Amino acid sequence: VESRISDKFKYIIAQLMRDTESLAKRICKDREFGTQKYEQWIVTVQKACMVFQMPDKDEESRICKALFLYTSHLRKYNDALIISEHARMKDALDYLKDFFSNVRAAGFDEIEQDLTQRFEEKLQELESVSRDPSNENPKLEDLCFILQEEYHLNPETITILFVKTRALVDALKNWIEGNPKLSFLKPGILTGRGKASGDHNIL
Amino acid sequence: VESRISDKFKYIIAQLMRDTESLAKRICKREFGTQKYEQWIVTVQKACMVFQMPDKDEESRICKALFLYTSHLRKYNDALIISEHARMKDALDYLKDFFSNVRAAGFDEIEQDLTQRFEEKLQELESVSRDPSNENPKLEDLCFILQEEYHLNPETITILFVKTRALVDALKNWIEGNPKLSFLKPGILTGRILDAFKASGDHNIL
RNA sequence: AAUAUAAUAGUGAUAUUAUAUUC
RNA sequence: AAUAUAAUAGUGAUAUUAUAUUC
Numbered sequence: 001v002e003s004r005i006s007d008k009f010k011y012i013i014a015q016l017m018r019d020t021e022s023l024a025k026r027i028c029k030d031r032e033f034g035t036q037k038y039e040q041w042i043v044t045v046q047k048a049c050m051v052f053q054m055p056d057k058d059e060e061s062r063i064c065k066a067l068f069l070y071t072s073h074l075r076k077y078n079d080a081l082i083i084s085e086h087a088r089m090k091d092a093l094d095y096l097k098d099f100f101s102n103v104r105a106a107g108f109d110e111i112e113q114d115l116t117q118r119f120e121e122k123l124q125e126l127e128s129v130s131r132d133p134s135n136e137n138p139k140l141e142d143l144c145f146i147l148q149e150e151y152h153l154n155p156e157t158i159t160i161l162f163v164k165t166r167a168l169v170d171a172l173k174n175w176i177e178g179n180p181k182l183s184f185l186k187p188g189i190l191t192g193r194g195k196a197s198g199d200h201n202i203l
Numbered sequence: 204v205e206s207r208i209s210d211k212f213k214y215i216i217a218q219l220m221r222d223t224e225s226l227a228k229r230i231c232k233r234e235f236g237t238q239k240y241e242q243w244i245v246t247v248q249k250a251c252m253v254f255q256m257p258d259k260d261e262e263s264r265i266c267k268a269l270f271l272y273t274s275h276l277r278k279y280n281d282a283l284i285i286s287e288h289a290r291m292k293d294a295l296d297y298l299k300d301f302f303s304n305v306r307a308a309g310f311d312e313i314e315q316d317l318t319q320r321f322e323e324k325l326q327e328l329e330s331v332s333r334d335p336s337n338e339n340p341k342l343e344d345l346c347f348i349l350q351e352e353y354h355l356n357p358e359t360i361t362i363l364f365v366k367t368r369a370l371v372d373a374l375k376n377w378i379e380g381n382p383k384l385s386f387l388k389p390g391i392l393t394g395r396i397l398d399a400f401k402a403s404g405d406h407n408i409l
Numbered sequence: 410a411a412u413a414u415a416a417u418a419g420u421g422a423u424a425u426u427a428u429a430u431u432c
Numbered sequence: 433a434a435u436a437u438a439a440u441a442g443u444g445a446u447a448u449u450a451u452a453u454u455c
């Protein structure tokens with residue numbers, strides 16, 4: 001199949017990656033978005049920020065915490081880009097929302113509050129952009145076609161759906177029951193433990 | 204002995220107290236450095252725990268807020284009492300200890316601002332603390348008694364009873380930090396030592 | 410803590426991440 | 433968790449804080 005033709009989501013979130021790496025661009029004294037290359041880069045950067053040293057140790061702690069947080073948010077945004085490449089944009093948005101929910105649960109950090117604030121500024125525009133039926137990815141459409149045809153021919157069909165990541169497991173889990181056309185499907189989840197006659201039609 | 208002269212420290216701390224009180228009085232509708240104020244601020248703190256709103260998260264933030272404000276108010280009060288029974292440096296060290304422990308636990312939006320408001324009066328407070336004219340007459344008289352009694356008898360085992368642990372640490376630091384009391388080697392006895400407190404031991408006063 | 414697989418970077422020993430398993 | 437003492441409001445049972453102790 002074909003990749004989705006236009007990213008509004010990535011267009012605006014590349015601005016949050018840019019603004020976050022601009023914030024990082026304030027404190028630093030010193031590649032494509034949505035790829036594994038950027039993940040490797042941001043991980044190596046995160047490991048590079050830990051070894052930076054100053055005579056004042058507390059200031060050092062402040063800016064190191066800052067850099068760690070910035071690179072972390074960057075990583076999560078990247079993850080969102082990928083997730084929405086392989087799934088709905090609602091799933092990526094909800095990934096980020098889960099992320100910031102956890103962050104809010106952690107405690108109030110000046111940096112975290114800032115970043116979450118700048119994210120919340122773009123939230124309306126974002127949810128505006130994934131509620132539209134126009135933006136549904138070609139891959140999920142084709143998958144929907146396959147499932148529809150196969151279950152039309154054989155309603156008793158048992159399916160098993162393999163995906164690379166657990167995030168995508170949750171993503172398609174929600175995508176199936178969030179899809180009116182797929183209503184004949186009774187999804188189920190199979191993953192690992194770590195950090196026909198029944199009614200589950202698809203696993 | 205008479206109570207202290209004029210307290211600039213108490214004036215500053217009082218202003219901070221009524222400012223914090225203004226922060227707390229924004230939401231809801233007897234002097235400073237007294238036990239009465241302590242009972243009052245306790246009952247008030249308990250009254251803020253009954254505060255209820257249809258919105259539970261905003262309620263959470265508000266009750267947390269009032270808890271923080273009442274807490275800092277309490278600590279201010281205690282600091283005033285300590286300054287009354289001891290050096291001003293002891294009170295400022297008490298407050299510094301408190302705010303340090305507050306910093307270590309992580310900063311809420313509000314605690315950061317309270318710490319910020321304390322920080323600006325910190326320089327003036329210390330400026331008052333380093334002022335010799337402001338010294339406590341109680342400690343004057345105590346120092347006098349110790350001086351006389353140890354002058355007449357160079358070997359004297361003293362035991363000094365005080366009300367609170369804060370005064371124990373305060374008077375320990377006061378004895379260790381007084382040039383006139385240099386003949387003293389203080390020691391501490393509190394609740395949850397004695398063999399070194401003898402006449403042949405390392406401790407003259409306990 | 411160890412192990413396997415996959416993608417990515419590197420000529421490669423490797424490295425990062427993802428996934429799974431074991432002790 | 434219980435017990436004692438002190439200060440404090442209440443006429444008082446009590447209550448708050450402080451101090452100390454015990455299981």
Ligand SMILES: *O[C@H]1[C@@H](O)[C@H](n2cnc3c(=O)[nH]c(N)nc32)O[C@@H]1COP(=O)(O)OP(=O)(O)OP(=O)(O)O
Nearest residue numbers: 166191192193194195410411412428429430431432
């Ligand atoms: O260095 C490791 C290791 O010493 C110890 N550890 C944790 N789980 C195991 C295990 O299954 N087998 C062995 N031999 N050793 C183990 O913990 C250290 C690291 O702690 P982690 O934070 O990685 O462990 P945690 O439980 O938080 O994560 P995970 O085990 O689920 O992946």
Ligand SMILES: *O[C@H]1[C@@H](O)[C@H](n2cnc3c(=O)[nH]c(N)nc32)O[C@@H]1COP(=O)(O)OP(=O)(O)OP(=O)(O)O
Nearest residue numbers: 368393394395433434435436450451452453454455
């Ligand atoms: O309700 C109390 C009680 O059940 C239990 N507890 C704590 N200390 C004791 C004790 O010495 N003897 C008995 N019988 N029971 C005890 O803990 C509950 C309350 O916990 P706390 O936070 O008050 O106890 P903590 O250790 O944190 O403080 P402290 O009393 O030792 O100073």
Ligand SMILES: [Mg+2]
Nearest residue numbers: 285367369370
């Ligand atoms: Mg005292």
